[PDB]
């Protein structure tokens with residue numbers, strides 16, 4: 684619900700294939716300080732299990748499909764990403780888990796800050812405690 | 820002999836949850852990321868690219884499948900196959916490139932040191948060669 688959006692990118696498609704460009708501050712609202720990507724995840728696996736207080740991210744499935752379970756206090760949605768020209772914006776204090784990674788799935792993440800363990804919330808009870816103060 | 824190009828190795832975090840590779844600007848690569856783009860769904864018989872730049876620095880990474888990058892400067896050519904998501908191909912100024920043999924499911928990611936500037940996109944092969952001969956020819 685809150686703090687999440689689907690963002691639509693340009694998709695230049697012709698006989699040479701498809702290309703999507705993303706420029707920091709233009710196609711997404713922040714500068715891209717860091718990217719990471721997740722591949723070769725087994726079909727029965729669920730990963731993620733984290734939130735953040737300060738980071739903004741955009742998640743994009745560049746091949747195959749993956750399901751993202753987004754939680755905030757009292758609220759939960761599952762969004763399937765399967766189109767490289769669509770990004771899932773996730774702002775602060777949303778908890779996420781990802782599952783149903785397909786064969787050959789590639790999940791790319793663009794992030795608004797360098798990695799900072801102090802801002803990675805990995806303990807769900809701590810999450811709930813911080814998040815109910817924001818959302819409730 | 821092949822100037823202005825390198826293979827860069829990234830961290831590959833592999834565990835029961837799969838693989839993850841992180842790339843932070845100025846740390847894992849030598850520039851800040853102003854732009855990314857990615858290429859998907861390329862037919863197996865296609866060659867694309869055919870360009871160079873004067874000022875742009877890029878890293879190419881094949882996140883799934885395999886793709887061949889033909890790099891050239893005057894008098895020199897190499898073809899590099901990218902097929903590992905934890906390896907990037909850095910390409911500096913005045914290297915001409917083409918990409919081909921994209922496999923089914925291939926995904927090529929490019930990280931770029933500047934926003935798109937048509938004026939730095941050298942598409943004329945004869946102009947490329949002229950400019951590049953001034954740089955590389957002794």
Ligand SMILES: C[C@H](O)COCC(COC[C@@H](C)O)(COC[C@@H](C)O)COC[C@@H](C)O
Nearest residue numbers: 729730731732733754778780805806807808
């Ligand atoms: C079946 C079992 O493996 C599920 O693990 C639940 C769990 C979900 O965490 C956040 C949840 C969405 O609220 C454990 O949480 C229970 C109490 C402790 O918060 C996931 O376990 C965390 C591992 C997988 O890193």
Ligand SMILES: Cc1cn([C@H]2C[C@H](O)[C@@H](CO)O2)c(=O)[nH]c1=O
Nearest residue numbers: 695702703704705854855856935
């Ligand atoms: C590579 C790239 C191309 N383009 C446009 C300009 C090129 O003339 C066109 C190629 O079809 O795509 C962008 O708008 N942004 C980009 O990052």
Ligand SMILES: Cc1cn([C@H]2C[C@H](O)[C@@H](CO)O2)c(=O)[nH]c1=O
Nearest residue numbers: 717718719798800832839841842
């Ligand atoms: C998401 C991400 C994780 N990691 C690593 C660091 C943490 O110690 C590890 C989780 O144990 O994930 C990075 O190094 N960079 C990143 O961008």
